[PDB]
Amino acid sequence: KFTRSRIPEKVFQASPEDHEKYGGDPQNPHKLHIVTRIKSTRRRPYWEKDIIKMLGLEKAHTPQVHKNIPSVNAKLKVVKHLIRIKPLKLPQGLPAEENMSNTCLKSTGELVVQWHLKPV
Amino acid sequence: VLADLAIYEPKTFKSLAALASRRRHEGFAAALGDGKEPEGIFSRVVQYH
Amino acid sequence: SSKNLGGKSSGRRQGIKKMEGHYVHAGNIIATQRHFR
Amino acid sequence: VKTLLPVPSFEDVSIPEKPKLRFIERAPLVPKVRREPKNLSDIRGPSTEATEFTEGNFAILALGGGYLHWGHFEMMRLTINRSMDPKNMFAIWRVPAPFKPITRKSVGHRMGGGKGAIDHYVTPVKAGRLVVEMGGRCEFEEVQGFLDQVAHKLPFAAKAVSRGTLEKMRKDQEERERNNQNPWTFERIATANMLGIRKVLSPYDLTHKGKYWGKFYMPKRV
Amino acid sequence: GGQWRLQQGLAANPSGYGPLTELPDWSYADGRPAPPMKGQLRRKAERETFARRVVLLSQEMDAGLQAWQLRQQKLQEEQRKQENALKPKGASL
Amino acid sequence: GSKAVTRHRRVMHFQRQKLMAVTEYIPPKPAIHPSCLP
Ligand SMILES: [Mg+2]
Ligand SMILES: [Mg+2]
Ligand SMILES: [Zn+2]
């Protein structure tokens, strides 16, 4: 019978080879995920559909920012095969009040604080 | 517009094809030599901020 | 030709009614069982 | 000149009395009155019993699941007993007598009206289980020949193996597993539910690791 | 198409997040800038909402960390104050 | 349909077929063939 699948925690334990393959630092991990739906919930179970709805990834290829906390991490682990997870990095600081209007997500995950339209 | 130029501006389309061939040769040279030094001239993308 | 007959009883719906940590009022049935469990 | 080597001596192997295969009866002495379902799982996956040598040094190894019945038992016993040497080889069974009752309905019968009467009995066999073991003061080549003869006539894939042969196969399987060069493994994907593949896979595939398909075993599957 | 665009970090679809999309299409011939385009306005609003959500989530995480640290400190101080109530006399002499 | 155990190899779901095709065993390949070097 087809049921929900529980994933062993040894899957979610990075090795130093993984820390070399990807740029993540096990000390001071990233605060926020960028999550993007890249696979339809059709031909998928209703619990995966509901989890996608809760995470707010109803629209495909639309990035959504989430916390890097265990509850939302379990939520993402449920539907990890339908989505893409990247760290949200801030080259400058967090968006301020006077720079909140002129910002851009700027794929590769770099939320740039100033967004001009001129060449460097 | 590429087909438009191919029909009505053959000189411009030949220039475009020459530029594409130059970039392709530069890509081959880059895959051979890892840049070192100039990484090509019609390479060097323009950055925006 | 189907010598076996009789075994057509419904489930008794027996088991735990209030689980661990559940607030309960006096008289509430906690678990219905046969053959003490 | 051609260099010579000492012959493998046999001074620590003793043949037992009654060295030939015991007769196997088609039906149990006490016949089963109650009819059981076809629990097809007793031929699925790897064998958990009779997987290692006990007294002999050669055997017939099953590479797939199946049911052995009295015709198969008679075939193997007759061929072994007529092709072996009583004074230097002994053969021992490793599968029980047929005990699983197979029922069949009367010919030209419509569907319904209860189960069918018990017709015969079979012995379930899983892949990786030794079926007949052989021992004595003999080398492997003659027994390998006339045991592959028998193994080719079994209902499943089978081979003639020895202690060294079987050990070599297991070590090569481990070596293939460790020196596999692609980074994508059936075990890893199935256990991590990568791509949501469990909607296509089976709950038994978590332990079968893609090496077993029904009653069929793939030894090159890694 | 462009996947090399992603390696340059440039929106694999060239129709978003770049001057080709975000610059004004036109302006008056005398020099006065044109009113903002509707798609550009909507994109700006969505970007502002995303940035505000990022700030809110980061602030909530930092506040939770501070609250946990404060709870641990308060519990440690309370237990240490519980420690010192000793007036032993039974085995003093 | 069929039972989980059958006699005819029971052709697989296409996703399972792709999984088996993608998870095949790849033997190591030396940089230079062992016979060529001395
Ligand atoms: Mg019943
Ligand atoms: Mg009923
Ligand atoms: Zn050579």
Contact call for E8 and B45, based on CB within 8 A = yes
Q: Which ligand is nearest to the CA of C4?
A: 1
D42, D126 Cβ separation under 8 angstroms: yes
| Whether A39 contacts A81, CB under 8 Å | yes
Chains F and E touch (3+ CB pairs under 8 A): no
> What is the side-by-side order of every strand in the sheet holding D100-104?
D66-68, D117-125, D100-104
Return the partners of chain D (3 or more C-beta pairs < 8 Å). A, C, F
How many angstroms does the Cα of residue D113 sit away from the middle of ligand 3? 73
> For the residues of C1-37, what is the DSSP string, one character each?
--------PPP---SBSS-TT----TT---B--SS--
The reported resolution of this PDB entry, expressed in Å, is: 2.6
Please name the method used to determine this structure. cryo-EM
Contact between chains at D191 and A11 (C-beta distance less than 8 A): yes
CB atoms within 10 A of CB E50: 19
How many Å apart are CA B48 and CA A116, to the nearest integer? 8
Closest CA to A77 of A108, A41, A35, A22: A35
Q: Which two tokens stand for residue E31?
A: 């020099």
Is residue D113 within a helix (H) or strand (E), and if so which, with residue range? none
Which structural domain, as residue segments, surrounds residue A10?
A: 1-117
The number of beta carbons lying within 10 Å of the beta carbon of residue E35 is: 8
Of A2, A3, A7, which is closest to D192 when you measure between CB atoms? A7
Distance, in Å, from the CA atom of D72 to the CA atom of D64, rounded to the nearest integer, reads 15
| H, E, C per residue of chain A | CCCCCCCCCCCCCCCHHHHHHCCCCCCCCCCEEEEEECCCCCCCCHHHHHHHHHHCCCCCCCCEEEECCHHHHHHHHHCHHHEEEEECECCCCCCCCCCCCCCECCCCCECECCCCCCEC
